[PDB]
């Protein structure tokens, strides 16, 4: 699809068999989702944003579908204000910016 | 142009007679720039991001040039860790997400 930016670029994602709303975010290096249960071991990570940082849990090789496009990669879990799909997964789905 | 997302989508902007590097950020509703002088009236605003909120000065009707594309809109000025071009200006240059 071609998504304009007059409203937030919110899409439906599927992770752990559950549908969630998330923001396609070119300004985010990484994908960070609100608290949920994911399988396997996690590693520590810090993410810096506008008003400071949040500590997150890094899960690797997680199956996630974004607007019907299947991806497998790193998902961070933590106290983010919104679910964010960052560049690590936007590249997997072949997303570009165009003007 | 077509901008891939293998690295941060940084571009040169011209604002307030200065050249700055800024991130094309679909996840940002607003444009926020590091401390600089801008002409005209301003009012205070709080903006939230992953790590809480920052206080900024809101300047309206500011002309920016992004990749040879001129636009006008509100620009927020404050202690952002990165200069961000948000949706309010991305729409004006005809920027879309494509996959
Ligand atoms: C509604 C929310 C989404 C947005 C809230 C928001 C709203 C605005 F009107 C302007 C800025 C921002 S924000 O900068 O706080 N941000 C945009 C994100 O794209 C930031 C931009 C940024 C980059 C680097 C340093 C500071 C800010 N990325 C961000 O927080 O990336 C983290 C998240 C995962 O990867 C790293 C989140
Ligand atoms: Cl990844
Ligand atoms: Cl505006
Ligand atoms: Cl349009």
UniProtKB/Swiss-Prot annotation, chains A, B:
The active site is at 25 (for protease activity). Residues 1-5, 49-55, 88-99 are annotated as: Dimerization of protease. Residues 20-89 form the Peptidase A2 domain. It comes from the Viruses. Homodimer, whose active site consists of two apposed aspartic acid residues. Aspartyl protease that mediates proteolytic cleavages of Gag and Gag-Pol polyproteins during or shortly after the release of the virion from the plasma membrane. Cleavages take place as an ordered, step-wise cascade to yield mature proteins. This process is called maturation. Displays maximal activity during the budding process just prior to particle release from the cell. Also cleaves Nef and Vif, probably concomitantly with viral structural proteins on maturation of virus particles. Hydrolyzes host EIF4GI and PABP1 in order to shut off the capped cellular mRNA translation. This is Protease.
């Amino acid at each position: 699809p071609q998504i304009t930016l007059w409203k937030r670029p919110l899409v439906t994602i599927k992770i752990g068999g559950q549908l969630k709303e998330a923001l396609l975010d070119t300004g985010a290096d990484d994908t960070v989702i609100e608290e949920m249960s994911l399988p396997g071991r996690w590693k520590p990570k810090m993410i810096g944003g506008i008003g400071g940082f949040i500590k997150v849990r890094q899960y690797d090789q997680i199956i996630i579908e974004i607007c019907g496009h299947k991806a497998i990669g790193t998902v961070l879990v933590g106290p983010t204000p919104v679910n964010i799909i960052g560049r690590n997964l936007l590249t997997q789905i072949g997303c570009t910016l165009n003007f």
